[PDB]
Amino acid sequence: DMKLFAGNATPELAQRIANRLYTSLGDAAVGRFSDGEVSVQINENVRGGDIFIIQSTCAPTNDNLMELVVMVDALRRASAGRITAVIPYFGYARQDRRVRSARVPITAKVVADFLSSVGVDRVLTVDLHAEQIQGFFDVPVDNVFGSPILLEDMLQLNLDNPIVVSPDIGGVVRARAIAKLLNDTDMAIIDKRVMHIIGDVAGRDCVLVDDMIDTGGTLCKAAEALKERGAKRVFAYATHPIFSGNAANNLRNSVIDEVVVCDTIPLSDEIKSLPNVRTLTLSGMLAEAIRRISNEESISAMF
Amino acid sequence: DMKLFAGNATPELAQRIANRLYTSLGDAAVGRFSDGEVSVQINENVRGGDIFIIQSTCAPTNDNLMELVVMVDALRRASAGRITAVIPYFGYARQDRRVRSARVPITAKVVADFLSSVGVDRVLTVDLHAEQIQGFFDVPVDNVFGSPILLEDMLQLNLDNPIVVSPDIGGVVRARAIAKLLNDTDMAIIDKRRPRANVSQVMHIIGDVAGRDCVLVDDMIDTGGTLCKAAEALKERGAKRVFAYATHPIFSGNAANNLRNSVIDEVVVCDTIPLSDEIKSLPNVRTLTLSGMLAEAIRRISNEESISAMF
Amino acid sequence: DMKLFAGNATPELAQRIANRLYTSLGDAAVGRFSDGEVSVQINENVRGGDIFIIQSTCAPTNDNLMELVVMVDALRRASAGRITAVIPYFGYARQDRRVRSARVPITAKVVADFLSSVGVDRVLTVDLHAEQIQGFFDVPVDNVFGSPILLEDMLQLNLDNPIVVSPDIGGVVRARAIAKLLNDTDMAIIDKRRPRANVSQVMHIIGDVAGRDCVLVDDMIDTGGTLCKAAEALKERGAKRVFAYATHPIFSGNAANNLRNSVIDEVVVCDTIPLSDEIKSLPNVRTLTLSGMLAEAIRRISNEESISAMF
Amino acid sequence: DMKLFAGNATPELAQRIANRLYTSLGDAAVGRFSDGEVSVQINENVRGGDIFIIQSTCAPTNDNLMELVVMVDALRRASAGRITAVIPYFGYARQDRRVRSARVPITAKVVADFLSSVGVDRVLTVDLHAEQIQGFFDVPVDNVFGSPILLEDMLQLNLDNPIVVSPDIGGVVRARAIAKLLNDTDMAIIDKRVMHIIGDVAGRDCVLVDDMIDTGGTLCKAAEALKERGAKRVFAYATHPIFSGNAANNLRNSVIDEVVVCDTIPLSDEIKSLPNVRTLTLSGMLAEAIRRISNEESISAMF
Amino acid sequence: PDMKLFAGNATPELAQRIANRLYTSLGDAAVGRFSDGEVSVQINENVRGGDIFIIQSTCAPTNDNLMELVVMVDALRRASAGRITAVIPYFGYARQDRRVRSARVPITAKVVADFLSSVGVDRVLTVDLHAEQIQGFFDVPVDNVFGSPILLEDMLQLNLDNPIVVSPDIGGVVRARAIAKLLNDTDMAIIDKRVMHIIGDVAGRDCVLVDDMIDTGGTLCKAAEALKERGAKRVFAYATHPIFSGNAANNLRNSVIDEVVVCDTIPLSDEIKSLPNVRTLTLSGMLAEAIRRISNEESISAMFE
Amino acid sequence: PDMKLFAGNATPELAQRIANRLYTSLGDAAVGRFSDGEVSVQINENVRGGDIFIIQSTCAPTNDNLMELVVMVDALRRASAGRITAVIPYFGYARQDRRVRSARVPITAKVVADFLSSVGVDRVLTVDLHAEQIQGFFDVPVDNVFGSPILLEDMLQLNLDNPIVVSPDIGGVVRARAIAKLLNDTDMAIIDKRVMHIIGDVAGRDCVLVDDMIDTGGTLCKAAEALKERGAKRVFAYATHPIFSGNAANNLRNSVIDEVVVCDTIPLSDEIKSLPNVRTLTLSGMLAEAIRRISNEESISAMFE
Ligand SMILES: [Cl-]
Ligand SMILES: [Cl-]
Ligand SMILES: [Cl-]
Ligand SMILES: [Cl-]
């Protein structure tokens, strides 16, 4: 039967998922030795079990990654029946290619190899930076989108003739998809050369959208440029709240009226102390995905 | 010793490359048995050689792919020193994911595995449909761009205040890159919408194209339907002349007729895929060779020189 | 739950098999994109199912093979419980070695690796050109023989003191096996020689065939040239009637004309490969179904019953 | 540069090969611990070297196999540049399929996997029982034929109108190939039901040929049946002298005028004491193959 | 229910004892030799979808017994076995587990692990591996069961006089210490070559020599002599694996060892079976319980006590 | 000639010392972090066809330093490096090398070996592996160099008074015995928890505590106290790997240890660097020579003496 475990990356999210599945997070001791080496022991019988591990590979990335892979190795050596890595936010996803044959690692592929090597049978994740990461594995990878929940929220805002806009050139595809869903509305595009805005945003509510928010620098400069060109209100929507570096002060001194993110990464206390940062939960979506996977039901029929 | 072999996919491109490397193509019998099974025999000693196979996996895709993987296997079992697959056009590249967990293959990855399995040590290709395909392999994958050569030709046209245009949302990154290099001009974008069955597909133009030559640029042209509708929409919004540039001339289905009946002043493509007879009969379709780029890339690989320097 | 899917290689055989298993073929869209790339989508839930794909890798070989491996990949990524490739005719089986270290591929092994790589859990096939192909895989490979069905039909002819004949040296083991089962009759062998350019190929007959019906038996017929010359030689040595039996009707090249112009009284083949229109027009070519054998083999695999019992 | 080593299977053959290559067998201690476990130590620097190991997997098969695989593992872990297994007689070659889905191992494939696993880069062997064994490896496999040397011998016999004959049904292909080479002469075929002889052998010299001779039982019964049907002289030719079981007494009480075999397996003293058993050496052929492999010269051009 | 047991010729008696404790007949695998000495294996029963356990130590003759095991696995895998567990009470080649000073030798324990993984072993069950780290030479689960509880139970029934537990060499000190703790927290002695020097008060006491295995018996016999030279009362030698190679029979027969007590992971030769001072314990209870737990997906942790 | 050295942030000073002894500049790998803490690696020089050595212990912070190493290897492999040798003086996670009593834990040493093999390491060079058998966790060559000759040379220059070599616990007895033999065939003492009990005559003698590594220092400090309680003269503690986690600085600062002598496979914190009773030896000579030999295809066996 089904068993859930969680590491130390997203335990609050993990509990929410467990509650919606009417079950609990099983007993695994996930900690550290004195020297900082990860320590894992599975304190339950998992023989022949259908195991799900809930763990984003978010900050601290390499520790949380190592927690996940050694949990998998422990479970596999303990004769787990099936092991699914539920990785709401998949870290290193941005390292997915070698532009101009630059001598960089393709770290997303490396992580996929690592997970495959320790015996992951399946991956469940939310809004991969690049969908092609599905092809970095042999095993099934289910990449569920956060947009159904983000959209539902955008709809409850009563936007005066909203235009959707991608903060940079690499997010245009995602912005367009959101524009389609938001009553087939217009899209603008920001092109840095100074930030040139391609599209008519004067007198309109603007929905800035991306897959993730990191330092918030580009997002903040974009929101400024939008209002410098006559935008009314500016909302920032993303799935993954990375919020590294000086993100909290960037958003606090920004022009953005509200920031809406999902809960694939926990928020720091500084970010929780901001009045205009709101959280939406994917616990319902992930719980349902988990249920369907456990019960051999179609996942296709949930997008 | 460097040795070049070609299959039947791109033999004229292969020949050009060999010419530019001041060499000749090696003796390999690449054909068919009576029943359509691929027949390969390498008719020279390749032991310890630095071998490059020049084969796009273009139409007919499955025969050309099989010729490739089978050539690799024969070379490997005959103790080739190193095997580089030069695949100017990498077929199946569009099958690179499972959107909404649709029960579809990721064939681009399957092809990568197949090449890896028979012992390809390196891949050289031009303008992969998705760069992430580099990550579908363990081995080095160099993904060169045709855009420098396309650009060289764009400059030779002397355009009236040209604007670069991406025919769809996926080509935007490339369009900008070219806008920058094309005398730091500006860019426009095609936003295709068709939300309802009773409403016609509209091709929205994000940007101002009125009274300006338009350079439509993309990685490939397949049936040309999007491209022709993009062209039409540009003219209706007041664009002067419309030029279409792309690397891969796939031109399947009704492409020749679509172009013939289009408002496109000229279509300029690279030679990663040989042109059909239907396409060769069009007056306004012109071809640029990447045999220069690929010869140098190959030269650098064999001499252990930096490939980064090529971008 | 057991589920059967078919590609476009052997859809009528697939249908027969489904009928005999009292089921229907699953919903899978197996086609092409405009450019000739294989397009597959599995249009039902296969999660945890016991899946069998029915596809010979017959002509066009490379398209049919690619359909197969791509179907497997889509099923695997969609969490099929188990995937069995039912490949009645296994193409590329003749490319199974490198004679004299000739610089050729061992494509039969390459195909095996490809199937393994995409996650085939088992292979079911009929009369592999070489049984050793079983060893080209890790997974279980069941190699069933068509000869029981061919034999059933041979017995229905009532022959005048029949002698079983292997059309070449490779079919001798099978010919004997059949000689034994065909009322423990005797056997003869065709020893083809052509040592010199100025001498005609002679087809030596080892054994006495005078005043006897001859049953030419083989695993396959391709162009039929050997078979027709074998037939002619038998008659010239005094054989009465000549019947030709084989499992795989490949019939490439000029096979139809070769048979039409032959002295062969009747040619009887199994349905592992669909017949060409050219062949269907011949009065003396007849077809036997293995859909009974393959349905039972599949039934046994899914119920975990002994396959050994099937020989 | 090139280095040769040998195990304890075919050291005399190995020395002959080494002599013809104007080199020597390098220092490897190949022996046993007290309990019978194989003991290997390579007593030379092999770093970056082009290594050839000479070792048939003949009786005792599993010991000689283990000697070979652990020699390879020792050499690989010691950073050998390239490792070629020269395996004149490839044992377990007869276990190459599962007839009627019999629940037997395909041991030939298993051995190939084992050799591949320890890091063999290439295999050189003589007259594989089944040529398809080339396809059991990823790596190059060169299967040289003994027939050029066997034929050269047959030619020096002045055979009165020789007929070539395969002792059983499974050797017909090989007999025919020999018949072609022996001035395109006739072939007969033995069919056990009593042994039926298909072909006219009355008043003719008979050349019984196979890839190997094991107990000699079938070979002896065949030679008898040939003379019972009026054959003049009967010669037995094979590449691999296995000579297991009661082979020596079988041949001694047989009708065979002479037995001619190659040196891919050493002869027992009982077999050496027979007046009508002669040996031909493949040391020249194997040395030449080794030389060509070492020098990146065509092997194709030696068949 | 879907469980089936098979066995090769390495440990037939042990295999039968295990089978008896699981109330299960041994499967029909015709494991023999062709005339030339090549292994012959045929499985004469349906194993499709089964949970299959093969009982075969890789003891002398090592290479033959290893090959039986691996070809048995291959035949079973190609015959569509559901799961395959290699039960290898004594794991041969375990001592070849490293390259000391980068000596040009094989890591044959790893080579064997690779071989077993390659032919499709899904898990390994084994007793007192020479090195525990051999668990890491596999990807698959490896259960390394200890003989110590059985050996300890026997020790406790001897009614020894103030026993001292002692290692035959410096290499066995860790185990000896552990068995000393378990044996009513008694004392430990240590044997160190310097002649053999005994570190500890052995005078007047029953001594218990302990090790994972006994090979030729040479060191063990000297150890026993030295102990009695220092006034030891009785000397017992407890070990798991009775390798007994070379001159072991004479060594034990001429020793001052009161009793050698070994487990049944390697069959005894007739000669050593005759020795009055050599006694065997069976692990068939332990191994049968482990198999039953693996079969029914119960905890293996509970096997250690 | 085709040799190039790179290094991450784990052991920069050691890497530089190795580089200096090979008269070779360290290659330009920009090894850093993005804003979020993800490893950032770019190789800013041609490495095509090169013989590449990466110098990176997987010491604290372990997971960051391991990830630097593996992504460095991947970047180099995809950039067409000819050969890649991971030089990992201290190999982290080496203690997680087994599953005792089938405990549901990872064999993380093996997981790391797999990871390194997967990204394309062609060989590993390392110093005093916690378990030698970790050599068998790889398919590729693994050279496990010993610190002992450097540590022994230092010991011999102290001009000790009738030194006795001693293990801090039962687990280090084998090494202690080996170093006793090398140290002019001197005596050995053993420390056994029973309070700590010293087995041996330490009275009036300089004692040399020896181990492969020092972590918190707790056991080492008690060991030193017990030795002096039994009349030891001076107590030195020699080890290879200075892990020094937890409260190591206070433990050493408050010890009765005259000198702690460690090798430079893990950099020292500023606090421990300040301690007057803590001294480092360098292995850069040894590792540089090993690399030079690997590079020129010379015997490594000669490195052990
Ligand atoms: Cl480069
Ligand atoms: Cl069966
Ligand atoms: Cl457990
Ligand atoms: Cl060396």
Author numbering:
A (entry chain B), D (entry chain B): 3 to 195, 204 to 313
B (entry chain C), C (entry chain C): 3 to 313
E (entry chain A), F (entry chain A): 2 to 195, 204 to 314
Quote the passages of the study that discuss this structure, keeping the authors' original sentences.
The E. coli ribose-phosphate pyrophosphokinase (EcKPRS) is a class I PRPP synthetase with well-defined kinetics. As observed in other members of this protein family, EcKPRS has two α/β/α-sandwich domains related by two-fold pseudo-symmetry.
Here, we report the X-ray crystal structure of EcKPRS, determined to 2.2 Å resolution. The space group was C2221 and there were three molecules in the asymmetric unit with a solvent content of 46% (Matthews number = 2.28). Each active site, which accommodates the substrates AMP and R5P, is composed of residues from two chains of the hexamer. The purine ring is sandwiched between a phenylalanine residue (F35) from one chain and an arginine (R96) from a second chain. In the EcKPRS structure, a region of electron density consistent with a phosphate ion, was found to occupy the site believed to bind the phosphate of the R5P substrate, based upon superposition of EcKPRS with the B. subtilis and human PRPP synthetase structures. The observed position of the loop also suggests that this part of the structure can occupy the allosteric binding site in place of the native ligand.
